[PDB]
Amino acid sequence: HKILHRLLQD
Amino acid sequence: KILHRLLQD
Amino acid sequence: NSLALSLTADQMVSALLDAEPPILYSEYDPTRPFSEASMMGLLTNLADRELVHMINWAKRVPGFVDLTLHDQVHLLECAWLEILMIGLVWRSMEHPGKLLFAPNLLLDRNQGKCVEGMVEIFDMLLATSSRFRMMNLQGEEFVCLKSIILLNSGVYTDHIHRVLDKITDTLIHLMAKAGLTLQQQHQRLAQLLLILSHIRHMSNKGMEHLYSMKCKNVVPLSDLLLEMLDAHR
Amino acid sequence: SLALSLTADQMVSALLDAEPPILYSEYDPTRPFSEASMMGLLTNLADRELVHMINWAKRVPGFVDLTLHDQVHLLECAWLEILMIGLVWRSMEHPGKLLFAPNLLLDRNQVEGMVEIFDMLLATSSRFRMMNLQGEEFVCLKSIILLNSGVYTFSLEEKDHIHRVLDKITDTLIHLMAKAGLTLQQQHQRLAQLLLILSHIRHMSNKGMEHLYSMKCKNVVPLSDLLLEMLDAHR
Ligand SMILES: C=CCCn1nc2c(C(F)(F)F)cccc2c1-c1ccc(O)cc1O
Ligand SMILES: C=CCCn1nc2c(C(F)(F)F)cccc2c1-c1ccc(O)cc1O
Numbered sequence: 001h002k003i004l005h006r007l008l009q010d
Numbered sequence: 011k012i013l014h015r016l017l018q019d
Numbered sequence: 020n021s022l023a024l025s026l027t028a029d030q031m032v033s034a035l036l037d038a039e040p041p042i043l044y045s046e047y048d049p050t051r052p053f054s055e056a057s058m059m060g061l062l063t064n065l066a067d068r069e070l071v072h073m074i075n076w077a078k079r080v081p082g083f084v085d086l087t088l089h090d091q092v093h094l095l096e097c098a099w100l101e102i103l104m105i106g107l108v109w110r111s112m113e114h115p116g117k118l119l120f121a122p123n124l125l126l127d128r129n130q131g132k133c134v135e136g137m138v139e140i141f142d143m144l145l146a147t148s149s150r151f152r153m154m155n156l157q158g159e160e161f162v163c164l165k166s167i168i169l170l171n172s173g174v175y176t177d178h179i180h181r182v183l184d185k186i187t188d189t190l191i192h193l194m195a196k197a198g199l200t201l202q203q204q205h206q207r208l209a210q211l212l213l214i215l216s217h218i219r220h221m222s223n224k225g226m227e228h229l230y231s232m233k234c235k236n237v238v239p240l241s242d243l244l245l246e247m248l249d250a251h252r
Numbered sequence: 253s254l255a256l257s258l259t260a261d262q263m264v265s266a267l268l269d270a271e272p273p274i275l276y277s278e279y280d281p282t283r284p285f286s287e288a289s290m291m292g293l294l295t296n297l298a299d300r301e302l303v304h305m306i307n308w309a310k311r312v313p314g315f316v317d318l319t320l321h322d323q324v325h326l327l328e329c330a331w332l333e334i335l336m337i338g339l340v341w342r343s344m345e346h347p348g349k350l351l352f353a354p355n356l357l358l359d360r361n362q363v364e365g366m367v368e369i370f371d372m373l374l375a376t377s378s379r380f381r382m383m384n385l386q387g388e389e390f391v392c393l394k395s396i397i398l399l400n401s402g403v404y405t406f407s408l409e410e411k412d413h414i415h416r417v418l419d420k421i422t423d424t425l426i427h428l429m430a431k432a433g434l435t436l437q438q439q440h441q442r443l444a445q446l447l448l449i450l451s452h453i454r455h456m457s458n459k460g461m462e463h464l465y466s467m468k469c470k471n472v473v474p475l476s477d478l479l480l481e482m483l484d485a486h487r
Contacts, residue, residue, distance in 0.1 A: 003243045004092050007074045012478045014324050016306045146404045171448050172455075175375035180445070187444040188437065201436075202423070205443060209422035210415075212447040213396070217404050219451045223458035 023081030023182050028192035031081060031185065035162040038079035040072035042110065045124035052126070055134045059238040065120060066103055067241045073102060080166045082182035096250035097173030100229075101222040102165060104144065108218075109161050111148040118144055136228050143221045150214060154207075157197070163190050164211060168218065226251050255313035255417050260427035263313060263420065267391035270311035272304035274342065277353040287363050291473040297352060298335055299476040305334055312395045314417035322410055328485035329402030332457040334394060336373065340453075341390050343377040350374065365463055372456050379449060383442070386432075392425050393446060397453065461486050 026034065045061050052058040077083050077095060086094070110119040117125045118141060131141035163186050170179050170186075190211070194204045229248055232238050240248070258266065277297045279285075285293075309315050309327060318326070342351045349357045350373055360370055399414050399421075425446070429439040464483055467473045475483075 002092065003246055004074070004095060005088065007071070007243075008078070008088055008091050008095075011324065012481055013306070013327060014320060016303065017310075017320055017323050017327075143405060150404065167448070171451060175372060175379065175452055183444070183448070184441045187441050190444075191440050205426050205440060206419045206422050208440060208444060209419070209425075209447060212444055213400050213418070213450070215448065215451045216400060216454045219454045220401075220458065223455065227462065 021082055021085045021178060021182070023085065024185060026081060026185070028189045031189045032159050032162070032193065034079070034081055035166060036159065038076050039162065040069070040076045043068050043072070043121060045121040047123065051130070053130060053133045055232075056237065058126070058130065058134055058137075059232060061124060062120065063238060063240055063244060065124070067244055069103060069106075070099065070243060070247070073099065077169055080169055081185075082178065083169065085178060093176070094169055094173040096247060097176065098169050099247050100225050101168050101172055101218050104221055104225065105161075105165055105168060105218055108144055108147045108151060109156075111144070112152045112156070115149065115152065116145065118148070136231070140221060140225055140228065143217070143224075147214065147217060147221070154210060156211075157193070159193050160190060160211065163193070164215065167212075168215060171215075172219070253314065253317050253413065253417075255317065256420065258313055258420065260424040263424045264388050264391070264428065266311065266313055267395060268387070270308055271391065272301070272308045272338075275300055275304070275353060277356040279353070279356040288472050290363060291467065293356065294352060295473060295475055295479060297356075299479055301335060301338075302331065302478055302482070305331065309398060312398055313420075314399065314413065317413060318410060322406065325406060326398055326402045328482055329405065330398050331482050332460050333397045333401055333453050336456055336460070337390075337394055337397060337453055340373055340377045340380060341385075343373070344381050344385065347378070347381070348374065350377070365466075369456060369460055369463065372452070372459075376449065376452055376456070383445060385446075386428070388428050389425065389446060392421050392428075393450065396421055396447075397450060400450075401454065 023031075043065060045065055050057070052061060074095065077091065083091060083094070107118060107120060111117060114125060117127055119125050126141070128138055128141050128145065131138040167183065167186055170183055174180075174183075187208070190208055191204055194207055199207060226248070230252060233240060233245070233248060275297060277293050279293055306327065309323070315323060315326075339350060339352060343349060346357060349359050350370065351357050358370070360367060360374065363370075396418065399418055403411060403414050422443070425443055426439055429442055434442060461483070465487065468475060468480070468483065
């Protein structure tokens with residue numbers, strides 16, 4: 001649910 | 011100041 | 020086995036130089052900020068945009084990619100403000116007495132002081148900038164320090180340590196390449212690394228200030244900044 | 253200055269001789285303690301330690317060459333870092349525990365907040381242990397903290413003198429490592445490893461200073477006049 005979790009993937 | 015006092019003798 | 024440990028000094032320097040994020044601009048409104056609202060509006064907006072470049076820069080720091088996602092997240096959560104701050108200090112070197120937040124946004128301590136609790140942090144940043152200038156800090160050295168901050172700041176809270184050693188090797192290689200004697204090399208390494216203590220200090224004090232600002236809830240904060248801030252409390 | 257003329261071996265001897273004593277707490281295993289009382293033990297202890305630290309600082313080569321105004325500033329900035337590194341050093345050979353005093357060893361399971369800080373102090377102690385940190389290295393690290401932590405928040409000739417002494421301490425550290433049989437690559441790496449730990453010590457100090465402010469305002473855990481004054485300096 002952290003934005004950083006998403007950003008670090010892409 | 012305590013620290014000042016302790017520092018000077 | 021991490022590819023990072025197999026790079027030569029020169030390859031490490033190139034990798035880091037190539038990974039540098041660009042220097043972003045602030046709004047083109049020529050109004051010099053003199054209030055909390057205006058100043059912090061500009062600073063958070065800038066920070067928000069810079070964060071996105073920082074995330075993609077981190078991924079390009081040798082060894083970072085070898086960490087689990089959760090570890091990458093933790094390092095970034097710990098270090099983000101230190102990293103923004105060291106960037107600011109670097110950009111400001113050639114402008115004594117000024118903080119170059121962006122090429123179109125130079126602030127001085129007279130602006131800092133129109134915001135409770137800000138001048139003390141401004142003054143620390145300025146002194147750090149001055150230190151960099153008087154040390155004739157080089158871009159190649161700067162990128163090593165920034166990577167060290169990324170990998171070191173959250174490291175407690177073997178791979179990372181081996182990568183940190185490699186960066187040390189790289190800083191020494193740079194200094195030897197620049198003609199420094201052996202004594203000058205270890206003295207300079209120590210000088211650079213001790214400055215990281217002060218960078219940590221400014222980040223910690225900054226973080227406190229931002230928490231206070233978050234609560235006041237006047238300055239708009241992005242959800243990403245909120246999460247980055249939350250990680251510290 | 254006399255500090256500038258010291259050989260590495262003389263610097264080390266001087267620092268070792270200047271070490272403060274290890275103090276006891278008032279802990280009593282037969283007595284019940286609360287979060288408040290257990291904290292009073294740490295603050296009472298820290299207060300008595302401060303007096304020894306002040307007298308220790310005067311024997312750190314270079315320190316007494318500074319104005320009283322600057323000595324005061326350095327100690328206000330560094331006092332918790334210095335207490336903390338000493339604690340971590342005392343705790344090296346006690347995995348999972350912090351040896352506040354020979355009669356006071358606490359584990360993670362010992363307070364409301366603070367566990368985060370305990371955990372960081374434990375990690376730092378584990379770190380020292382893994383590096384097999386030497387006493388000679390420890391006393392160098394502690395003197396570096398004293399001189400360095402406040403150096404960027406004050407003639408700025410005073411600042412130059414501090415930087416010179418600091419460089420001397422780096423020389424001393426390298427000297428120690430060379431004498432230990434480390435290759436040059438190994439010396440530089442270990443020097444960096446040691447100095448990066450100082451960033452973590454700074455962090456723990458900053459986080460502790462914030463926790464202590466809450467404790468004060470809470471006005472439950474006792475705090476000596478000197479400790480209140482040392483705290484005010486960071487605020
Ligand atoms: C919430 C994001 C703002 C980041 N930030 N905060 C700063 C402060 C204080 F508010 F924490 F006190 C003082 C000085 C600079 C600050 C920055 C900042 C640093 C570098 C950068 O490129 C952008 C920034 O907003
Ligand atoms: C008012 C003086 C207390 C000093 N202090 N504070 C500590 C904390 C926290 F409460 F700030 F979080 C956590 C862990 C150790 C703390 C110490 C301390 C450190 C070393 C020492 O020899 C004595 C101490 O009280």
